[PDB]
Amino acid sequence: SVPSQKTYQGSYGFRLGFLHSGTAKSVTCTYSPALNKLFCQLAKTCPVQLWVDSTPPPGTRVRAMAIYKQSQHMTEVVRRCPHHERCSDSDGLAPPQHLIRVEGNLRAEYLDDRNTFRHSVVVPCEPPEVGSDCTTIHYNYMCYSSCMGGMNRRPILTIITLEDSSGNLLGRDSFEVRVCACPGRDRRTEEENLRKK
Numbered sequence: 001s002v003p004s005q006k007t008y009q010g011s012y013g014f015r016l017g018f019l020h021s022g023t024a025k026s027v028t029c030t031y032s033p034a035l036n037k038l039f040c041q042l043a044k045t046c047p048v049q050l051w052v053d054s055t056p057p058p059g060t061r062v063r064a065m066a067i068y069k070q071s072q073h074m075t076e077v078v079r080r081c082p083h084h085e086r087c088s089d090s091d092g093l094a095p096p097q098h099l100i101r102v103e104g105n106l107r108a109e110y111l112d113d114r115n116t117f118r119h120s121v122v123v124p125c126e127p128p129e130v131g132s133d134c135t136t137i138h139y140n141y142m143c144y145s146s147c148m149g150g151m152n153r154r155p156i157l158t159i160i161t162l163e164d165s166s167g168n169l170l171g172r173d174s175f176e177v178r179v180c181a182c183p184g185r186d187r188r189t190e191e192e193n194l195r196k197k
């Protein structure tokens with residue numbers, strides 16, 4: 001089984017947005033539009049904006065899930081490596097095996113799928129604060145892309161789904177993720193490789 005990654009705005013015009021954080025050596029999270037790829041440091045805040053054209057019903061939720069990007073690995077569950085799943089860095093809510101956490105939301109729920117064994121984290125949709133035009137979720141990625149015995153240098157993508165109260169699909173978007181020590185340099189490197197190619 002493999003979750004769909006097809007971009008789908010749906011009835012509410014759902015799509016993601018990312019800040020413009022630049023590529024300085026010191027940056028902890030930065031998004032490349034040209035690569036549709038987020039680069040971030042281990043366990044650091046990753047702001048992801050949610051945008052809609054119209055308001056979804058009460059009880060709508062937003063779920064995040066990681067899959068391997070390469071087809072020959074896509075059936076493998078993305079999980080934390082043998083070291084990080086045992087490092088007792090729990091926040092009291094996320095299971096220690098889950099790669100993706102939501103930061104600072106006590107309503108986050110973590111799912112181990114009973115049939116696929118895949119991990120996901122889902123939060124209730126809330127309207128923007130007064131004066132804002134979108135809602136931001138803060139994610140953390142809890143292993144490096146390079147972690148031996150886990151991602152092991154394989155690229156992943158995060159799939160963000162808008163769901164109704166039963167879990168039915170209302171919208172979908174996605175982005176590649178690299179968790180690395182120097183997101184600014186790696187974004188510059190990969191963007192240059194893309195330009196030369």
Ligand SMILES: O=C(O)c1cc(I)c(-n2cc(F)c(F)c2)c(I)c1O
Pocket residue numbers: 050051052054055056062124125126127128133134135162
């Ligand atoms: O303008 C509004 O009234 C409005 C209401 C909602 I509920 C959301 N919303 C929150 C999410 F997590 C999500 F996926 C969509 C947004 I973004 C809005 O702009």
Ligand SMILES: [Zn+2]
Pocket residue numbers: 080081082083084085142143144147148150
């Ligand atoms: Zn790890």
